């Protein structure tokens, strides 16, 4: 299990910019512009444009509030008039340079519209968002705009009994089948297009009730799925339906410890400036006995692609003679491959679209959407497993250290408004710091990263507002030792400026900078006076930031024992000399000790010169 | 149904089962004719709807009379009373598909021990 966050930053001790509109709640949708300087917020009954560099600067505002006759219609359907019967923005996507595509629950009448960016006024397109947007603010939902066409995963109805992964195309509308083999009680988590003869694919991530597994209760299972951008459906069968829909198990577990995380919470696509293949960073929690635990598994796209392209499918079979069981299909697979895209191979066999695929192949995919092979993580284990924390959303920044060693920086939000910064150091997790983003411990519902030159920020939304944080707080570190010991690839010590700087931001010289991810503060170069009355009591204040260090006191060059009657420890860090007399005068030193590898790192926290009067 | 025009009573021939759902053949199997007045049919379906809509399929006093069939991710509800009159044929917000726990019971009018009934026509 991952250790405790090395340093805890109170909302008070760091520079965090906040945004909220009075009487406006549920800041669940976040979208930043092309230029990255304008962040758009989708809340309950409102859409805003804020300066992404200072979220507190409100630029534009637009509302989409529900009428009383629509609220009462919703309430008459036994829903909560002042809770669920309101317009929760669920779809906030780029449409053009001059517009956004917006959908809201709208007292259970999913409605879509175009937000005119030049005016920040809605165009009144008033489209029926049934299938595109959920009815209930409680229902799961995911959407990705690909080539001005919305690819959405949510419920097709009011009750949330009909799930749907569909494309609102207008030219070629396509949707999933309303069948258990296709989708079995899913809870949508994330979707994105993975761009390139070879066609683009639109991946979907969700948790659904498993068909392959049987246990005491119904077992959930994380799913990775994909569809082909060029899909047009089948001609005779799969009319207006996906022909390219294949899914597989997403497995996040440490078995030598019986830890299985079968509930997917978030998915982030690490788009490597260097690496040609994207890495999905997926966030999971266990369905069973969650108390709570969180795990972060990283999946190489190539792995998943290997399953969808060459993996054996699963067959459903009748078993004695009213039951259905699912097993590996070892029978003959049709050609062209069921679920495959219109690639170079297909085009050679005179196949231009799904509309001209053989009925043999189309029937196969319709009856075999599920793959036998699981999609496994890189190094076949989670990147991080944490206890006593319920992680909510994830973002990852691939950063180059001073050394040139590349670290994948994990920003993980909690259900209590906190953000953890973690890196997988040499075969062990290091949680650099934790920051309390929300003073009200509101769970971070959404998280969004901008790693772009200048505007390097993380944006977190909750029901109470939005928070803007940098990727590091290098300046909070006082000494070179403190700067190095942090083991943050973002932070380096600058001897000329006598400040711990943010490497890859500051205008300090690279060649003349200090950073050691080993934590060996050895690479570094290197008195509060008091006058108290006789008989009186002294409180010598001492504090440090490491949650992984312990402090001890020293008087007259010896390790002082804070025991009654002469001594006491107030708050485990502040020394208390009780009965002051001639001999108590002199130097009192507060020291810290923290283990890095095998070695211990002692640091002098406080220096005190106590003088007792006569 | 009774015809001379179209009655209000459903006459249904039933046969006892053999060990796909074949009726036990020859003298080992028997048949019966049961009458289920369609108002009795509607009374029960209406009370199955009413329970499932307003009182969680429980129906006072006691209880567990309606549920959602075919494993559909729906449940019975505690909807306003007005739902019954407002939505007789249901809506996007009402539980579906509903089914009764309580069966519609009929005692035979005909009980033939060695015969396997295949067709019914009734007149008056
Ligand atoms: C994600 O999965 C892909 C799929 O294989 C990984 O890519 C491949 O990794 C192998 C392993 O070495 C590469 O093979 C060889 O690399 C050595 C190293 O220099 C080279 O000397 C050999 O001649 C050969 O090239 C293979 O080329 C490479 N292919 C691609 C497209 O990347 C990828 O590394 C995985 N990424 C992660 C983070 O797991
Ligand atoms: C949108 O944001 C608002 C802002 O907090 C969320 O409001 C909160 O709603 C919950 C209920 O869902 C309130 O909890 C209470 O639950 C008990 C249990 O029965 C009930 O008896 C109480 O009357 C109350 O509803 C919570 O107090 C309330 N917060 C505030 C400040 O009023 C809202 O739930 C969010 N909606 C979504 C879809 O996230
Ligand atoms: C089952 O419940 C349904 C309602 O959900 C009952 O239907 C309602 O039944 C009444 C009883 O007759 C109907 O009223 C009558 O309509 C006729 C038609 O013109 C009229 O001539 C009579 O004077 C009277 O107004 C009512 O229209 C009907 N509503 C609907 C939507 O069907 C049904 O009778 C119940 N069946 C049983 C066995 O309980
Ligand atoms: C989007 O909003 C802009 C903002 O007004 C609209 O611009 C006006 O467009 C008309 C022509 O249609 C011009 O005559 C006005 O002078 C424009 N005013 C401004 C301030 O630019 C634009 O038309 C809107 N687009 C749509 C589709 O409604
Ligand atoms: C969602 O589907 C609707 C259904 O057609 C699309 O509506 C058409 O939109 C185009 C402009 O993009 C208009 O020229 C057509 O006249 C519209 N037809 C109808 C029937 O609405 C809509 O554009 C789709 N939206 C997205 C984001 O894909
Ligand atoms: C982690 O999240 C779980 C829920 O997923 C929390 O468990 C709930 O805690 C509340 C607080 O009293 C209880 O009323 C609920 O009954 C609990 N539900 C379950 C399923 O246990 C858990 O406390 C959270 N723990 C941490 C460390 O975040
Ligand atoms: C932007 O941030 C600065 C930093 O303190 C603050 O002084 C200024 O008022 C903020 N702008 C707005 C509109 O809040």
Tab-separated table of N, CA and C in Angstrom, chain A residues 23-29 41-48 62-65 82-90 105 137 463:
chain	number	residue	atom	x	y	z
A	23	UNK	N	-25.896	31.087	-5.108
A	23	UNK	CA	-27.126	30.295	-5.322
A	23	UNK	C	-27.067	29.316	-6.496
A	24	UNK	N	-25.875	29.190	-7.132
A	24	UNK	CA	-25.593	28.245	-8.212
A	24	UNK	C	-24.682	27.143	-7.659
A	25	UNK	N	-25.074	25.855	-7.873
A	25	UNK	CA	-24.389	24.660	-7.337
A	25	UNK	C	-24.104	23.611	-8.417
A	26	UNK	N	-23.472	22.478	-8.033
A	26	UNK	CA	-23.149	21.338	-8.913
A	26	UNK	C	-22.308	21.727	-10.139
A	27	UNK	N	-21.060	22.163	-9.891
A	27	UNK	CA	-20.081	22.597	-10.894
A	27	UNK	C	-19.355	21.366	-11.467
A	28	UNK	N	-20.141	20.428	-12.040
A	28	UNK	CA	-19.742	19.116	-12.574
A	28	UNK	C	-19.114	19.051	-13.977
A	29	UNK	N	-19.310	20.075	-14.843
A	29	UNK	CA	-18.748	20.070	-16.206
A	29	UNK	C	-17.669	21.127	-16.372
A	41	UNK	N	-17.342	26.686	-17.371
A	41	UNK	CA	-17.921	25.882	-16.293
A	41	UNK	C	-19.409	25.610	-16.565
A	42	UNK	N	-19.781	24.332	-16.513
A	42	UNK	CA	-21.153	23.860	-16.658
A	42	UNK	C	-21.687	23.466	-15.297
A	43	UNK	N	-22.632	24.249	-14.775
A	43	UNK	CA	-23.172	24.001	-13.441
A	43	UNK	C	-24.640	23.626	-13.500
A	44	UNK	N	-25.350	23.680	-12.345
A	44	UNK	CA	-26.786	23.426	-12.329
A	44	UNK	C	-27.493	24.742	-12.732
A	45	UNK	N	-28.205	24.701	-13.869
A	45	UNK	CA	-28.961	25.800	-14.481
A	45	UNK	C	-28.122	26.983	-14.970
A	46	UNK	N	-26.788	26.800	-15.159
A	46	UNK	CA	-25.904	27.870	-15.643
A	46	UNK	C	-24.633	27.398	-16.331
A	47	UNK	N	-24.094	28.247	-17.231
A	47	UNK	CA	-22.811	28.080	-17.925
A	47	UNK	C	-22.062	29.410	-17.860
A	48	UNK	N	-20.780	29.346	-17.438
A	48	UNK	CA	-19.892	30.502	-17.259
A	48	UNK	C	-18.628	30.351	-18.094
A	62	UNK	N	-24.303	32.703	-18.506
A	62	UNK	CA	-25.537	32.329	-19.189
A	62	UNK	C	-26.275	31.316	-18.325
A	63	UNK	N	-27.586	31.492	-18.207
A	63	UNK	CA	-28.447	30.643	-17.400
A	63	UNK	C	-29.385	29.879	-18.298
A	64	UNK	N	-29.943	28.780	-17.781
A	64	UNK	CA	-30.893	27.913	-18.472
A	64	UNK	C	-31.735	27.269	-17.367
A	65	UNK	N	-32.503	28.115	-16.674
A	65	UNK	CA	-33.331	27.772	-15.519
A	65	UNK	C	-34.668	27.147	-15.900
A	82	UNK	N	-37.326	20.682	-5.765
A	82	UNK	CA	-36.239	21.638	-5.581
A	82	UNK	C	-34.843	21.009	-5.680
A	83	UNK	N	-34.781	19.691	-5.933
A	83	UNK	CA	-33.514	18.980	-6.078
A	83	UNK	C	-33.348	18.465	-7.515
A	84	UNK	N	-34.004	17.347	-7.844
A	84	UNK	CA	-33.854	16.713	-9.140
A	84	UNK	C	-34.551	17.387	-10.304
A	85	UNK	N	-35.579	18.214	-10.028
A	85	UNK	CA	-36.359	18.899	-11.062
A	85	UNK	C	-35.728	20.216	-11.526
A	86	UNK	N	-34.414	20.199	-11.793
A	86	UNK	CA	-33.662	21.378	-12.238
A	86	UNK	C	-32.732	21.016	-13.392
A	87	UNK	N	-32.253	22.024	-14.136
A	87	UNK	CA	-31.390	21.790	-15.289
A	87	UNK	C	-29.884	21.578	-15.001
A	88	UNK	N	-29.493	20.319	-14.772
A	88	UNK	CA	-28.099	19.981	-14.524
A	88	UNK	C	-27.387	19.848	-15.862
A	89	UNK	N	-26.400	20.719	-16.150
A	89	UNK	CA	-25.602	20.638	-17.387
A	89	UNK	C	-24.784	19.341	-17.338
A	90	UNK	N	-24.994	18.496	-18.352
A	90	UNK	CA	-24.371	17.178	-18.483
A	90	UNK	C	-23.432	17.053	-19.675
A	105	UNK	N	-30.164	18.063	-17.952
A	105	UNK	CA	-31.216	17.108	-17.552
A	105	UNK	C	-32.598	17.713	-17.782
A	137	UNK	N	-30.258	13.544	-12.550
A	137	UNK	CA	-28.917	14.053	-12.185
A	137	UNK	C	-28.048	13.016	-11.455
A	463	UNK	N	-19.750	20.234	-5.870
A	463	UNK	CA	-21.080	20.882	-5.795
A	463	UNK	C	-21.013	22.333	-5.263
